[PDB]
Design a protein around this ligand. Structure first.
Ligand SMILES: [Zn+2]
Length: 301
């Protein structure tokens, strides 16, 4: 059978180091990786964030949980598929490690952010464009998988830990609603532009976690040019086809420039003020805007 065999492969595979897998890099791709390789990357993320050891996760249970999440993504359009969710999680790991946000967060927050990044597009006919203000995410399928026999990666948590973790997971998944990002970001941007931003209070914490989910969710926009151009083209094709191709391709530069200006640039600027080591996300976003703008101008002939 398909199910049992995937598990055996994964559980008995050597998990290469973070270094070897390049998951600490903001520039990380995934294009060339197999699903099994992404699963090994995911085990490494849980491991190097100390989640497996601090919460007593059983190896085979973690493997089964990863494989159940991937399986439940099967019917999704490609831009809300397992690879997107995996990329969102890798950006979170990179932001925690290279971007040094790990020191600013608790173990429960880190655990929930990783699980949310991985689960946020599990939603259970025309589909909305990627990151539309009209999308609304749900946590129901994430929780169902977490509570499923053999998949209970939170079994090691005390009841109080468990209830708090679920609350943060729900908030973090709901944070990927772009409408909620747009609604709340003004308060974030104002606290920072002044210098009043403070991780101390429950509220400014929840808000920072939400801005970080958004920053990871949109992070294809920060990638080196050949990766961003590729993703954007694929994403566009996935929506527009759900002189034909010319009409499609000619829209894309102005789409991306508009999205960077309205949504992305200010967020990665704000993130960089919280942690200067998240600078490469901003830099990459700025370089892609330059590249798409030159294409928008050259397409006007
Ligand atoms: Zn997403």
């Amino acid at each position: 059978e398909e199910e049992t065999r995937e598990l055996q492969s994964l559980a008995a595979a050597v998990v290469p180091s973070a270094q070897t897998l390049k998951i600490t890099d903001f520039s990380f791709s995934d294009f060339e990786l197999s699903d099994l390789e992404t699963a090994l990357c995911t085990i490494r993320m849980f491991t190097d964030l100390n989640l497996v050891q601090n919460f007593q996760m059983k190896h085979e249970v973690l493997c089964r949980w990863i494989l159940s999440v991937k399986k439940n993504y099967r019917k999704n359009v490609a831009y809300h598929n397992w690879r997107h969710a995996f990329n969102t999680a890798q950006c979170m790991f990179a932001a925690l490690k290279a971007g040094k946000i790990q020191n600013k967060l608790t173990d429960l927050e880190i655990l929930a952010l990783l699980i949310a990044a991985l689960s946020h597009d599990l939603d259970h006919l025309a589909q909305l464009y990627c990151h539309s203000i009209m999308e609304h995410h749900h946590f129901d399928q994430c929780l169902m998988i977490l509570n499923s026999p053999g998949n209970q990666i939170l079994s090691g948590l005390s009841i109080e830990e468990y209830k708090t973790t679920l609350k943060i997971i729900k908030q973090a998944i709901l944070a990927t609603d772009l409408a909620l990002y747009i609604k709340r970001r003004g308060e974030f941007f104002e606290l920072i532009r002044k210098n009043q931003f403070n991780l101390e209070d429950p509220h400014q914490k929840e808000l920072f976690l939400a801005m970080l989910m958004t920053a990871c969710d949109l992070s294809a926009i920060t990638k080196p040019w050949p990766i961003q151009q590729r993703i954007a083209e694929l994403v566009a094709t996935e929506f527009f086809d759900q002189l034909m191709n010319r009409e499609k391709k000619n829209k894309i530069p102005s789409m991306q420039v508009g999205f960077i200006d309205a949504i992305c640039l200010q967020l990665y600027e704000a993130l960089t003020h919280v942690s200067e080591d998240c600078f490469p996300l901003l830099d990459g976003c700025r370089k892609n805007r330059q590249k798409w703008q030159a294409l928008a101008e050259q397409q006007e002939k």
